[PDB]
Amino acid sequence: QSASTLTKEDVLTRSVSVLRGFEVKTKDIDLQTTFVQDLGMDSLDLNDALVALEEEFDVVFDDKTANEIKTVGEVVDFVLANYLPTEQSINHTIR
């Protein structure tokens, strides 16, 4: 119920597809793949990607983490540690 069902392979796989829909230099994305160097995102492109990765996983990056994020693997680490399913109504669970 109110617990995460996320694996490191799924979060990475969903992260790559969401990053593939952008205009990146390379489609070969792994954990070590940096945003500035490998994919080539400026200030605004990076934050478009972060919000896009927010919507996919229903998570919200904190300001401190978002400003300091470098690699794709850091995003996968953040999603796994912070993801929570949204609370449901009083009827969804007990019925």
Partner: protein, 80 residues
């Protein structure tokens, strides 16, 4: 149609809808009591029917308060 439990599709998908089913099910017992008491011309059955109505209304209130407090627990932050 009853033996395949068709009544399980007629009950709604909220906790309050279960409460309504219980009230309807108990009301079926009272209608059966009134029907038998009137045919027999027996006031003891009608006294029983009156008792069922009052008691069935008591558990309706007790169950509602539990559901009321259950909803309050979810809305507990109340920072306002």
């Amino acid at each position: 149609m009853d033996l395949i439990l068709l009544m399980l599709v007629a009950v709604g998908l909220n906790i309050i809808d279960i409460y309504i089913m219980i009230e309807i099910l108990i009301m079926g017992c009272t209608v059966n009591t009134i029907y038998s008491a009137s045919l027999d011309n027996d006031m003891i059955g009608l006294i029983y029917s009156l008792i069922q109505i009052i008691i069935a209304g008591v558990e309706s209130a007790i169950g509602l308060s539990i559901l009321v407090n259950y909803n309050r627990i979810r809305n507990s932050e109340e920072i306002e």
